[PDB]
Design a protein around this nucleic acid. Structure first.
Lengths: 103, 78, 97, 95, 93, 105, 97, 80
DNA sequence: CCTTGGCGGTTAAAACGCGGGGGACAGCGCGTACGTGCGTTTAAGCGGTGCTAGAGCTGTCTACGACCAATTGAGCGGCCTCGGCACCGGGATTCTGAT
DNA sequence: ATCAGAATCCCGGTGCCGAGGCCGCTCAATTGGTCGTAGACAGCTCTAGCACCGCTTAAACGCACGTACGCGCTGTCCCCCGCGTTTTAACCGCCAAGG
C-alpha cells in the first residue's frame, strides 16, 4: 500500500476516502492524508506513552480506562485539548483540598 | 418518580466532587438542575430519533446530541 | 466507638476518588429517564446503551458542578456548601440567562 | 450484517511499538477510536474553513499544517509539524 | 466590487414591520453577520444529519428538524409553522 | 409568478440562497423546497428581532435604530438571550444593571 | 462645589457608563500593546485599523464578563471590596486559562 | 516597551464601573493586565496564523473575525 | 434480532432514630486601606504631508487531480487457549482517637 | 507523646474469560493511463499604512486627607455527621413474545 511508502501504521486510502465522503471540499490533494496520518499517529503515540506510564503506576499490564483518564488529566496540554470531552469510565484525579484537612 | 435519586447517592456524588459537608436544600437544587439538563438532552435526542423515523433511541442520537451541547463524550463510538 | 467528624468524610473522599463505577444505580434512574422522555412521544423503546451514556454523562456533569460549587463555598470563607453556591456557579457557566 | 469499521489493528501496532510489554482493553480501543474520530473531524472542519476563507478548493498539505498549528496546543503542535513534514518528505522523495 | 450583502432585503423587512423607521449602516452590518451566522449554523447541522443517516441530499425535512434542534420551544414552533405555510403555498401554487 | 420569491410570497430571495447552497459543500444534491423553508425561517427570525428593535427605538423616541437599541432588544428577550449568549455585538454596551446591595440604604 | 460621602460618585459613574456606549480603553496605547505582542510572533507586520478596533471590542467584552462574574463572586462573599482571589475563582470556574 | 502599563489605572477603573464594580482594590490592576495579556496572546497567535496562511504581509479584520469564530466568542458587526 | 416484562429470592442500600459537637452566624472593635479633590502634570488625538509595501486584479499555462478499469492482499468474520486479573482469606501496617 | 484498635494495604491463591493468535476469504486500495482545469506565478496600479509634525486640550497623577469596610476575636445555637436499627427494593437469573 501507500502506508509503508511513508512508513506509518495508519492508512492513506481510507483517510482519502473519508475526505471525499465527508464532502470537506471538492478535491483532495496528493500527500495531505499522509500528513494527517502522521499527525494522528504522533498524537496517539504521546497518549499511549502516558497511558503506559499510568499502567506502570498501578502495576498492571493491560490498560484500563482509568489509566487513560489520569494520563489525559495529568499533562497540561492534554488537559487543555481533552478538557471539554469527558470519558466514559473515566473518573477524576486524586484531589483533596488542603484547606479541608484536619489538624 | 424523581425519588429514586436517594440522599446517600447525592452524598456520594458530593464525595467524588470534592465536598466535605452538605446542607439540606442541596438535594432539591440538585434534582432541579438534573431535571433541566436531562430535559434538554432528551429533547435533542428524540429530535434526532424523529428525524431517523424510528421508534427507539439509539446510542448515536445521544452521542450527537451531546456533541450539539458542546459536551462531547467518548467511549461509545461517535 | 465513635470517631470525629471529617474522619469518615475525607476517608470516603479518598475511597471514592478511585473507582469509576457508577453510583446512581440502574433501575430507578431508568424509570426516571423514561418518565422524562414520556412527555415527548408515547411509548418509546430504549436501547441500554443510551441509558448507560446518559448515566455516565449525568454523574460526570454533577462531579464538575460539585467541583465549582465547593470552590465557591470555600472561597466565600465557608466549609459547607449551600444552594446559592450552585446558583452562583451556574450563573457563572452561563446556563441561567 | 453491515461490515462496520474500526481502528483497532493500527493503534494496536503503534502500542506494540512504543510499549511492547503492555496490553489493552477493547473498551479502551473503542475510546481511542472515538478519540481519533474527534481529532479527525476537528481537523476536517478547520481545513474546511481554511478552504472557505481562502477562496480555493484544492486542499494541499499546507492547509492541513496550519490547521494542525491552530487546533493543538503549541509545543505538541511543533512536534506534530515535525512529524508531518518528515512524513511528507519521506513519502514524496521516494515513491 | 460585487460584494453581495443582504441590505435591501432586510430594508423590505423593516418597511413591512415598522414602516417609518430608519436604520444605520453598522446595524445593517450586524444584521448581515446575524443572517450569515444562522445560515451557517442551520446548513452545518443539516449536513451533520445528512451524514448521520447517510442520506446524500437535502430536502426540506432536514431543515425542519434542524431548526427543531437549534432554537428552543416557542420560537421553534412558530418557525415550523411559518416554514410549513410558505412551503405549502409554494407547493400548491 | 416568474421569480420563486413571488412564488413563495416572501422577501429573502430563495435563488441567492440556492446559489450559496450549491457552493456550500453540504450534501450532493439540493432540493427545490428546502431553500424556501430556510428563507421563511430566516425571515421570521429577522422580523422577530426587528420587532424588538422597533420597540427599543420607540422607548427612547429615536428614529434610526442604533446598535445600542439592538443590544437592548436582544437582552430584553428571554429566548433570544438563550440563543445568542455566546454572541457579542459591537458598539453594544450592556443592560442598565444595578445589584441589590450596591445601592445606599 | 462640595464633597459628599464616598459612594455617590460610584453610582454616578455606573449610571453614566451604562448610559454611555463607546470605548473605555483609549486607542493608541492599545495599538502599541497589540504591536508589542504581535512583533514577538512575526516581524514587520502591517495592520487594518478596524482589526485593532475589533480587538479592542473583544477585550472590553472579555473584561466586562470577567468583572460581572467577579462582582457576583464578591456579592456572594458578603463583600464589596474585590480581591484577586475572586478573579482566581472566576477564571477557575469558567475553565479558561 | 511597558505598554502593558499603557493600560491605565483609570481605564481599569472605567471598565470596572461599566461592568458594575463599586469597590476596586489596588491589587486587582496588574492581575487584570495579565489576564488581558494572555487573552491577546491567544487571539493574536490565531490572527498571525491566518495571516501567514494568507501569504500576505498584512493582517485583516476578517482574519480577526474568523479567529474569534474559532474561539467561541463571535463578533458581529465588522463583516463576516 | 433485540427489547420488554413477569416472577422469585435475595442482601445491600436506604430510611429512620438520635446526640453532640463543631461549623455558621452575629456582633463589634478598629484601623488601616482607599475614595475624593486639586492643582499638578501627562500625552491623546485631531488635523495636515508625503511615501510606497503590498493588496489586489489579470492572464497563462501546465502541472497535478478526477476518473476508468483490473487486481490482490491485507482486513475482517469467526474460532480457540491462556494467563491477567477480580476476588478470598491472612497478616501487617497505618492511621486516628482516648489517654 | 502513647498505646488500642479498627481501616486499609498487601501477599499468596484461583479459575475463568476476554485478548489475542490464528484461519478463510473479498472488496477496497492499488496501478496506470487519459483528460481538464485550477492555481502559481508574473506583471500592474493604485490604496492604505506608515512615519512624522503642531498644537492643543482633555485627561492621568501624587498625595493629603478622612473614613468605612475588612478582618480578627468572641460568643452563640442547632444541623449535620455519624452510628444502631428496621425496612425494602435493585439486582440476578430465568423465560417468552413480539415488534
Amino acid at each position: 500500500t501507500r502506508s509503508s511508502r511513508a512508513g506509518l501504521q495508519f492508512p492513506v486510502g481510507r483517510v482519502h476516502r473519508l475526505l471525499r465522503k465527508g464532502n470537506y471540499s471538492e478535491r483532495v490533494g496528493a500527500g495531505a492524508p499522509v500528513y494527517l496520518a502522521a499527525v494522528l499517529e504522533y498524537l496517539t503515540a504521546e497518549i499511549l506513552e502516558l497511558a503506559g506510564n499510568a499502567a506502570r503506576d498501578n502495576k498492571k499490564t493491560r490498560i484500563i480506562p482509568r489509566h487513560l483518564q489520569l494520563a489525559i488529566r495529568n499533562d497540561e496540554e492534554l488537559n487543555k485539548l481533552l478538557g471539554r470531552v469527558t470519558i466514559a469510565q473515566g473518573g477524576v484525579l486524586p484531589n483533596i483540598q488542603a484547606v479541608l484537612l484536619p489538624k | 418518580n424523581i425519588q429514586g435519586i436517594t440522599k446517600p447517592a447525592i452524598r456520594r456524588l458530593a464525595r467524588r466532587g470534592g465536598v466535605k459537608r452538605i446542607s439540606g436544600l442541596i438535594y432539591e437544587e440538585t434534582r432541579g438542575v438534573l431535571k433541566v439538563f436531562l430535559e434538554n438532552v432528551i429533547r435533542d435526542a428524540v429530535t434526532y430519533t424523529e428525524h431517523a423515523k424510528r421508534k427507539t433511541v439509539t446510542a448515536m442520537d445521544v452521542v450527537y446530541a451531546l456533541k450539539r451541547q458542546g459536551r462531547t463524550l467518548y467511549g461509545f463510538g461517535g | 466507638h465513635r470517631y470525629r467528624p471529617g474522619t469518615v468524610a475525607l476517608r470516603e473522599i479518598r475511597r471514592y476518588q478511585k473507582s469509576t463505577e457508577l453510583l446512581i444505580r440502574k433501575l430507578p434512574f431508568q424509570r426516571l429517564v423514561r418518565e422524562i422522555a414520556q412527555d415527548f412521544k408515547t411509548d418509546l423503546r430504549f436501547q441500554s446503551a443510551a441509558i448507560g451514556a446518559l448515566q455516565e454523562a449525568s454523574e460526570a456533569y454533577l462531579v464538575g458542578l460539585f467541583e465549582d460549587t465547593n470552590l465557591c463555598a470555600i472561597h466565600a470563607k465557608r466549609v459547607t456548601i449551600m444552594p446559592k453556591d450552585i446558583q452562583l456557579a451556574r450563573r457563572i457557566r452561563g446556563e441561567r440567562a | 450484517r453491515s461490515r462496520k469499521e474500526s481502528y483497532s489493528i493500527y493503534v494496536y501496532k503503534v502500542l506494540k511499538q512504543v510499549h511492547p510489554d503492555t496490553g489493552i482493553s477493547s473498551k479502551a480501543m473503542g475510546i481511542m477510536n472515538s478519540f481519533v474520530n474527534d481529532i479527525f473531524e476537528r481537523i476536517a472542519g478547520e481545513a474546511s474553513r481554511l478552504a472557505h476563507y481562502n477562496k480555493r478548493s484544492t486542499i494541499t498539505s499546507r492547509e492541513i499544517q496550519t490547521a494542525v498549528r491552530l487546533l493543538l496546543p503549541g509545543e505538541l503542535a511543533k512536534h506534530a509539524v515535525s512529524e508531518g513534514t518528515k512524513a511528507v518528505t519521506k513519502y514524496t522523495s521516494a515513491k
